[PDB]
């Protein structure tokens, strides 16, 4: 049974775009722009795109297309590095454990939006505290006693019923049902592979853009939207002197493009050999970043409208993360005429943003492990059910009363330093141990031209240096786990560190296992470990390029 190919090129392109574009593009990037010099922030962000993210996008796409393997089994080219693929698969599973809970929040809000009186508009509900204040009468983004903030935290999260990560409580049945719907949708999107996932991304990857267009058209007309847009784009070039601006740009690029997460390789593994993955990488990464920039306009139109409504400044309402889309934006919707339609479309947009990223993350695991074990390849529906059901069970923790604390711990540690280290290790493998020249020969075989000197230099020095820089800052910028005013106990930090290390130790562990399992002398074992599995007959002939300086000096 040969590997199938995408039904269309558009299927592959929309899968890549839907994975790359998600809630991050919307609820993180515009805030980073606003707080890091506005238009000035685009300089570090675009720079890092061009020199690290587009190169990594291109490398992962070409690797997947050429080898037609998942993240794990692609390391037939460099056997010692298969622990890196195992680590990225584990990280993708970890991420899915909490990403689907955010998707379930979006689904909960969408269900709540099917009314003419949105539950977050007013007080007087069962979840409202006695201190709830009508927002018309009312820093602000964290007031916590508005109907929207109270609705979120007390009728969606029920966070008031949990003291901390030590008292997370039981899963909440409403969020449990929303999670069940999310996982059922994911299963029936993924159980038949790309033949159906590529058609599902036609909806999931494109609907967000229609919603964004209508949201932009309406928001630009809102009172005070121009002030919010000016705050969004106001250029402060002196912010570029600060290291934090560049750190934020690098982290945003790395995490928003999703290169090296095992998803793009899995998607490209279903490409036809002659597909132009260079142009695909350029187009898809550009689409991701431009989507972020465009969505910032709608976000800050609504933020300026809210600031004008409350007679406050933009900094008093500017927020990021769940706070923005689940407290600030719903209140603005409730203020707008036709608030029901706006809420419905906004939360359908959130669902569409999240669902295809979850699809990509789960396909990373499915493809990577099915390529590794042929039994899983033979049983796609059963293995997909196993993956989705395990994700549901281990996301049950994040829908508990204190599930927000578990989700904070996971969001911090599942795919932070661990994913950065894994991507650094795989970039190093590909561009140094396997060889950037070998990779260029592979791309020439696929596409008829070798990648230019710029891309090779990026792969060998700039992308590795960028990844090492982000790893180093992530380690340096470790702030003990906290959520709002809550400070996690030390054991919670230990658990998060264990989660981060669980995937990171797979790399040295797999290298040790490969060395010990291989037969021969020390140098024979090393040569087998660093030699492509289809060239292992050459080792007996003592013909190893990695043992020559020319291989390492290849630029």
């Amino acid at each position, epitope marked *: 049974q040969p590997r199938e190919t995408w039904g269309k090129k558009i299927d592959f392109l929309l899968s890549v775009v839907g994975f790359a574009v998600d809630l991050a593009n919307v609820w993180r990037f515009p805030y980073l722009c606003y707080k890091n010099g506005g238009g000035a922030f685009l300089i570090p962000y675009t720079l890092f795109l061009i020199i690290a993210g587009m190169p990594l996008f291109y490398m992962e796409l070409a690797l997947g297309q050429y080898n*037609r393997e998942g993240a794990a089994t692609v390391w037939k080219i460099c056997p010692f590095f298969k622990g890196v693929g195992y680590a990225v698969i584990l990280i993708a599973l970890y991420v899915g454990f909490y990403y689907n809970v955010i998707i379930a929040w979006s689904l909960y809000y969408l269900f709540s939006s099917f009314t003419l009186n949105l539950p977050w508009t007013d007080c007087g509900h069962t979840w409202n505290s006695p201190n709830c204040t009508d927002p018309k009468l009312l820093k602000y983004s964290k007031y916590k006693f508005t109907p929207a903030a109270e609705f979120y935290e007390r009728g969606v999260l029920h966070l008031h019923e949990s003291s901390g990560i030590h008292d997370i409580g039981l899963p909440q049945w409403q969020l449990l049902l929303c999670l069940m719907v999310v996982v059922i949708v994911l299963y029936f999107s993924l159980w038949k592979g790309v033949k159906t996932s590529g058609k599902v991304v036609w909806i999931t990857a494109t609907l967000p853009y229609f919603v964004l267009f209508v949201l932009l058209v309406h928001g630009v007309t809102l009172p005070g939207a121009s002030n919010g847009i000016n705050a969004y784009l106001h250029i402060d070039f002196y912010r570029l002197k600060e290291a934090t601006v560049w750190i934020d740009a690098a982290t945003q690029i790395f995490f928003s493009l999703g290169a090296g997460f095992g998803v793009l390789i899995a998607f490209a593994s279903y490409n036809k050999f002659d597909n132009n993955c260079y142009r695909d990488a350029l187009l898809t990464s550009s689409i991701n970043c431009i989507t972020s920039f465009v969505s910032g306009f709608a976000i800050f139109s609504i933020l300026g409208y809210m600031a004008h409504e409350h007679k406050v400044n933009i900094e008093d309402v500017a927020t990021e993360g769940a706070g923005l889309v689940f407290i600030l934006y719903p209140e603005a919707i409730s203020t707008l005429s036709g608030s029901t339609f706006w809420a419905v479309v906004f939360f359908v947009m959130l669902l569409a943003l999240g669902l295809d990223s979850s699809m990509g993350g789960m396909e990373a695991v499915i493809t990577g492990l099915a390529d590794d074990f042929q039994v899983l390849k033979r049983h796609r529906k059963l293995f997909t059910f196993g993956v989705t059901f395990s994700t549901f069970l281990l996301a049950l923790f994040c829908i508990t009363k204190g599930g927000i604390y578990v989700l904070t711990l996971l969001d911090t540690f599942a795919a932070g330093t661990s994913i950065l280290f894994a991507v650094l290790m795989e970039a190093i493998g590909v561009s140094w141990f396997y060889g950037v020249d070998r990779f260029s020969n592979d791309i020439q075989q696929m596409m008829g031209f070798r990648p230019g000197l710029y891309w090779r230099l990026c792969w060998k020095f700039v992308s590795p240096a960028f990844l090492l820089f982000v790893v180093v800052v992530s380690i340096i910028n470790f702030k003990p786990l906290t959520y709002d005013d809550y400070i996690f106990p030390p054991w919670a930090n230990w658990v998060g560190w264990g989660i981060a290390l669980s995937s990171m130790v797979l790399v040295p562990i797999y290298v040790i296992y490969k060395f010990l399992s291989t037969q021969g002398s020390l140098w024979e074992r090393l040569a087998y470990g660093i030699t492509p599995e*289809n060239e292992h007959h050459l080792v007996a002939q003592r013909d190893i390029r990695q043992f020559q300086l020319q291989h390492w000096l290849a630029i």
Partner: nanobody
Amino acid sequence: EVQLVESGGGLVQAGGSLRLSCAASGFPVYQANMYWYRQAGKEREWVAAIQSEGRTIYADSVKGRFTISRDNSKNTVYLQMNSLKPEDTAVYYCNVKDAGWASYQYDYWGQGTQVTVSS
């Protein structure tokens, strides 16, 4: 069943020409990624490819000398090799990578045809 039948190989005099054929069955070559490889105590090295859209690409060592073509009616891919060198001596393998989009990645290889160039 997908089958690639290599033919046309044989002994050539340095500077001579040879037309290798690859009769393909089970798929249409006019939409497939058809690749030619060769394996001289050396690894299998890509030689030329005629791709699903008809684009012909060649390895550097053979570029300008070899010409890859395909006959849609005969479902055959031709590697027309001119100006053959003693370094071209090898077993030439016709390979189908896939039949384009909405197809399968049958990375199927023919048994290969030996080409010998005598100085």
